[PDB]
């Protein structure tokens, strides 16, 4: 359906980057390595929000950046790691919406790329990955932060994501169909292309009447995505293969022959 997502990265003052997504559309960023670190709009539907909205977001990141420089120091102490090594703290949370209500909220954390601590599906308990996260879970259980997570995920995350979908309905609630074509290269290869589609969810399959080479969906840089699927066929047998494209922007699916 629809999802608002946030990705926080603190690398060891430390480097703090925060990014917000609505579906596959980025709408906010924060970079501690900017000339004036602040919450910057990445989508036109969030640009017209008042200065009281943006300054509250900016001071949120500015104080979240300070919270991570001490957290990385506390994490370095839990594991007895050296003060010279670089370490990464990752923070992930968001809310999924068909009736416009919370389908699932999530909250995950990662230290150095492995799972550290995560809010449970009940939004009232935690799961620690090791004895270091048990100190963090006990820290957040004393503060009862899972209660504040309920207030955000079940509420603030849902109503504000619903507002973003309304102000940007011209682009967010609009599926761009892929522009497909087949290329042929001699090897002694039939590549099926898909360009300029939104969202990134697409299915590329080469049928004959497990052997396709898929690539991960890449961003075009304009808000759309690209992806191709290549298969190897013997010479004189190209007329037997048909590429199939499934996408939300397509009235009916597309079949393609060389």
């Amino acid at each position: 359906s629809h999802s608002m997502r946030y990705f926080y990265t603190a690398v060891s003052e430390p480097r703090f980057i925060a990014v917000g997504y609505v579906d596959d559309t980025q709408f906010v960023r924060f970079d501690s390595d900017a000339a004036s670190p602040r919450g910057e709009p990445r989508a036109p539907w969030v640009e017209q929000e008042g200065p009281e909205y943006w300054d509250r977001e900016t001071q949120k990141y500015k104080r979240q950046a300070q919270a991570d420089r001490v957290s990385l120091r506390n994490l370095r102490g839990y594991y007895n790691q050296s003060e010279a090594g670089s370490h990464t703290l990752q923070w992930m949370y968001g809310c999924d919406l068909p009736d416009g209500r919370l389908l699932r909220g999530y909250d995950q954390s990662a230290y150095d790329g492995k799972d550290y601590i995560a809010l449970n599906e009940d939004l009232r308990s935690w799961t620690a990955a090791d004895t270091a996260a048990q100190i963090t879970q006990r820290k957040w259980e004393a503060a009862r932060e899972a209660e504040q997570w309920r207030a955000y995920l079940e509420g603030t995350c849902v109503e504000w994501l619903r507002r973003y979908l309304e102000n940007g309905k011209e682009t967010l609630q609009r599926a761009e169909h892929p522009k497909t074509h087949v290329t042929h290269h001699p090897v002694s290869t039939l590549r099926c292309w898909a360009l300029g589609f939104y969202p990134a969810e697409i299915t590329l399959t080469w049928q004959r009447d497990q052997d396709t080479e898929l690539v991960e969906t890449r961003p075009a840089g304009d808000g759309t995505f690209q992806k191709w699927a290549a298969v190897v066929v013997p010479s004189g047998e190209e007329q037997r293969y048909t590429c199939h494209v499934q996408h939300e922007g397509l009235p009916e699916p597309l079949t393609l022959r060389w």
Partner: peptide, 9 residues
Amino acid sequence: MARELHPEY
């Protein structure tokens, strides 16, 4: 709309 200030680890 981002999450408010979270407690430290």
